[PDB]
Amino acid sequence: MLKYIIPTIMLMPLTWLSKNNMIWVNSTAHSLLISFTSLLLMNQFGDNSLNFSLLFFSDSLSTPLLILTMWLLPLMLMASQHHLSKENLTRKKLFITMLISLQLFLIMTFTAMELILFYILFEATLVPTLIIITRWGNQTERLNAGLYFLFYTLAGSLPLLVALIYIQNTVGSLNFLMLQYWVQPVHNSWSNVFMWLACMMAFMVKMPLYGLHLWLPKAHVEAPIAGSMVLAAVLLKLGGYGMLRITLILNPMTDFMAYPFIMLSLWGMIMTSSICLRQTDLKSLIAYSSVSHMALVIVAILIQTPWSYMGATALMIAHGLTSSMLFCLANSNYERIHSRTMILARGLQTLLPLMATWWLLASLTNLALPPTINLIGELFVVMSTFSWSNITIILMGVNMVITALYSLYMLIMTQRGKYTYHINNISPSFTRENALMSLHILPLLLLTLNPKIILGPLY
Amino acid sequence: DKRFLKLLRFYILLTGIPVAIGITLINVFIGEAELAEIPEGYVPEHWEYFKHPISRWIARTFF
Amino acid sequence: LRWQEDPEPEDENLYEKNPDSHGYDKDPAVDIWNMRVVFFFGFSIVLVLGSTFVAYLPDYRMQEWARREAERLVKYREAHGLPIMESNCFDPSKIQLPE
Amino acid sequence: SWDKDVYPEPPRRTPAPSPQTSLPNPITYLTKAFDLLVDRPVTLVREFIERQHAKNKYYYYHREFRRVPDITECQEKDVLCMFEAEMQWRRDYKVDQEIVNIIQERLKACQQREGESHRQNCAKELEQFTQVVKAYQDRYHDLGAHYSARKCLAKQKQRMLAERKAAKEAAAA
Amino acid sequence: MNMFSSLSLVTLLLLTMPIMMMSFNTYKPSNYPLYVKTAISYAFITSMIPTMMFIHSGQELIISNWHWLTIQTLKLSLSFKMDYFSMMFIPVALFVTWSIMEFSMWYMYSDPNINKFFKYLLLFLITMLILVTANNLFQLFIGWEGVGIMSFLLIGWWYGRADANTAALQAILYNRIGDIGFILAMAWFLTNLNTWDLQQIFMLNPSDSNMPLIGLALAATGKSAQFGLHPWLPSAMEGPTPVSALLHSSTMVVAGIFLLIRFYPLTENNKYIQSITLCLGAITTLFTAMCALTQNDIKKIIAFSTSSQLGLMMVTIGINQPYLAFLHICTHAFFKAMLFMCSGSIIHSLNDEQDIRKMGGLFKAMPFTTTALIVGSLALTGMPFLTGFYSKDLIIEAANTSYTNAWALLMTLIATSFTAIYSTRIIFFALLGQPRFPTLVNINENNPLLINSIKRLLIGSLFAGYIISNNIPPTTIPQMTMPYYLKTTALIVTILGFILALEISNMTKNLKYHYPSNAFKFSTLLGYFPTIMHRLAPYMNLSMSQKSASSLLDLIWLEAILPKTISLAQMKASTLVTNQKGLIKLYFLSFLITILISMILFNFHE
């Protein structure tokens, strides 16, 4: 994995040693080249994973997440260079450096072959994430948002450390390949109940699970645009990726320990879908839409069928591009009217024709339209959950209705109707903005032609 | 809006047209491999198990 | 007036000083170059050459191989009056049941 | 191109034309227009391509996998033996998925071919489909997402124990 | 095989090329609507060659050209089913679509975005052919949702109008409630039969099909606007008339019916399902025809007419006559599409006036729109030997002679009587009598685009039923023996309707003061279902979203029970620790306490 790690490190000196006015051009150009090389991770086999060394490996679950991770960096540099244009030069470079340091930790986190190495890099993602929110955030609440974000993660992820270390002293190893052959069934005792919760609470909080999600509306609304993209596209998938791996050593206790978390997810997604109907803040609605989509991933991972695991992998990749695109579309408005209230600027399709097309496409992939990978992932979970219990079709069906309601309520409220009379600074869309939307949607639609590369190791 | 869409289709076609011409010229003039039995005592290269010339160029060079 | 504070600066319009602006930079020359690296490496390279790379991945995860092997096995077993598939994955001769 | 034994189909039985009308048949003349305007130039262009392909012939092979000892012979926690046995089981599991897919294709093809006579003329294909689904279900069903050779074996040994207990209790009967 | 399959696929490919010529820009905008219309006409010609081969020799086939995805033992492929139902519907839909595109080149002329109008119409047609030719449920779902979205974009065409946006979103809600049933069928079929492909579903032929079928029945209810999920169809008249003539009359709305027909090998062996679809149709056909009697907007009468008709194809499905239901889809497409086009020629000539109370006097002013309106109304009511008579009267003869719910049979007959009333309601109020429209008369229908498009559908509204009826192969045993009073019951209630309607209409010209009744208000207000359900249901759901889900739970109790209480405790504990008095005397006095406790309570000295 050094062939990606070393280049990602070289982005830092490149940024710092660039001419003052070429910091964005140089970092964008070279982060795109790194993303091109990451398609070499597709060398997957039907039986074995791609095991590079004692430290790193890459199977079909981590490969799409890595490609998605390295694709978002150039898009984040595109999304950020406008509102940082007046920032002084040395803070522009520290911002790029925080984004790069995040990508370095992420790619190592998704390929770490050992669970303690995965853990250290999994909490290492907090530090750059927090600094971006609380330094370059834009409102007084960014300071409180950073605290909730920080102390929800650590409250759950310190018990995980005690659990992981206990496992290594019991099994003798935490290498994921080794754990596949040395795993032993988890007997049902009170001491194993808390081993299950310790192994899982750190990941539920990050998905996030309903109930412990309160940090996400804060963090995803107060972050600068680059922070919200990486928060929604990737960081919520560390919890899913962590769960998809650590459940290997939790059976058969997951059979009954999953019930309280399946109920929270199934009912929770209906609650968060309804919340989106009465949101006054555009960025906050898009934040709550992630909580509803990630509840499907939690249900998928916990029922543990081959179909749900394929669906969970497709949703995580599909949600990453869709939610990231919705944050950028909303930020394109914010940068004109300097507000986040949904009702403030209306009828924007009259003033920004092409940008309305981007809104339509992002809304259509969000409410899961066939054959987009957003539907494919969602359908596979709905299929596998119906087998788990036929009554689940009721709550999965009802959620499908509400998702269509708030996806088009968002589209109708902002883009349609009569324009706001007194807002007269809606300048035409910039080439930078149009290219930023098409670099989300175009790969998303292309993945429909060859979905097999985003369906995971159960494919 | 028009300018962006114009640039979008210029840069997509900038490599799309050569690649479509190149793929077409490979298929017409090189064509796909033929399935065959492994001759006795012969050990195929790992990239000799794939049908399309571009597929086995990828396997040979990168993978 | 309360502590000395800069008044909030009036927001700038990139189309005012450069009606050809792409929205990348205030410098017209850098503005153009930044658009070209994004459009070239973004669309012409990663998306187009990456799409072709994915289309011709050498038998991704052995799906094509397994189909050829299933044809080979189904042909053999049916020409020999054997069942196509067996309930037992492992030979019962090598399994010692408890008791 | 493909093997007729794996993907069998009966022989075609096309009735002979037997008109009893004076009007010309529109389909007959369109078919000859198609064989001239379409099929003919298409066949010409394909032949040119084939000529270029016969000039440069190269081959690819079907990979053969040596049999290795399976999970049952692997000593507990000997990862080197378990690794090879597991990679083999994961290949046979994928090969068995395609076998079921082959049998399903036969069933679907038979149903369409027989039309309104399908419920009686596809009784053999249905019989084959029922069995291979029964075979595949015993090996692989209810294993979960983290399926392995070890869990497959544990499932079989539970099933073998059930049959054995079932057999003896009927010996007295 | 080679001619049948090549021409059947090109028809689909031929329609997508105008969409793909919109890719590279400015190919020519001045010609685009004509280009999109000319392509539909050539697709009609090529689609007729396979339909002739099927008529001649019964040739049917399935094309699984492309393998898309294989999830373990479920191989999904792009598979097209070129069979009876698709060889007859495809040419019918292309003929009607050809007229509505020629009619739109005149009706939408002044529109600044006529190009996007024609792209959208062609996108719908592409998604409607995918639905029809689909061979597996996944591919059928793509078309199912595809028509649902192009319906949303065309209803809300005038996006600055609030009523258009509300109506467009209303259609999506009702169709997504129906889609719950579609997913339930897909989940059941995958779980129980291990397939989404229609060959396999019929080959296995489950006898326990109550759950999958009620799901398919639930999908049909929303897509075809049967009672319960019916209000979206009349509301969907907000869109331009060509949208209504095509989607919400002729083609898109019969997708719910067309789905049940595809699954007739399952519904025919399930008596419990036939009872539901029988009753569901009968209430739909009578309740909606009743609502049509008191409507005054010309587009809403035709919309409730469409609801009434779709509720009769559901009755046909309920009595185990799927093929008669299919024949009614094809015939109904001809005259119903013509009625919208005629009603759109009247609305155009009176400057967007849609109320029949400002019409009248147009019998001679618009002679050709008059003829097509009369032909269309006669075909709708089933007058003998018009295109409507070749499917409806068989349906009423097959419903009379069946072992059927007695109430459904009566409701079906009463609704057939109301059909002759609200057809007279249009000819009488729109054409006869004296003019009631403004004084500046701008009536003029002499456009060649308007006449030719109506002219083709008019011909179809006369002879299409006869030509189709006598060319398709028999698939059932028609019932031709029955009492004199069952053979003619369809014709007789239609006559009683005309007579009764004519008398009631002429009662409007007597100088007697009106006196509203409850029945009138109930019919005018659409049974109050929209007024109650489109106020109460959103109010409850939107209230709970803010009061309970958002405010009470997320902003309060979920904050209180963890971050707020945990934070509050640590603050209080901090003040107890730090609030000290800095006195040597008190600090050392605590050391003594600690030392004594260590020896007495805890015995740390042992």
Ligand SMILES: CCCCCCCCCCCCCCCCCC(=O)OC[C@H](COP(=O)(O)OCCN)OC(=O)CCCCCCCCCCCCCCCCC
């Ligand atoms: C395994 C399950 C895991 C999943 C469940 C997760 C549960 C959620 C846990 C999240 C942690 C609690 C939320 C903390 C949010 C940050 C605190 C905050 O924002 O409140 C502000 C409050 C006001 O004080 P202050 O900010 O200093 O005033 C500044 C004035 N401008 O600040 C304060 O008043 C001081 C707050 C200090 C407390 C910080 C949190 C420490 C958490 C560790 C508690 C350890 C308790 C040990 C005690 C044991 C003995 C009883």
Ligand SMILES: CCCCCCCCCCCCCCCCCC(=O)OC[C@H](COP(=O)(O)OCCN)OC(=O)CCCCCCCCCCCCCCCCC
């Ligand atoms: C909103 C806050 C967000 C954060 C969420 C925090 C959640 C923490 C969850 C901790 C508790 C997890 C449950 C563990 C309790 C111990 C379970 C136990 O000992 O019994 C296990 C038992 C095993 O025996 P078995 O044969 O499988 O079946 C018998 C059925 N009793 O089998 C079982 O009993 C299985 C069922 C036991 C669990 C019962 C579930 C309660 C009902 C669902 C409530 C949903 C969640 C409630 C959240 C309230 C929030 C305040």
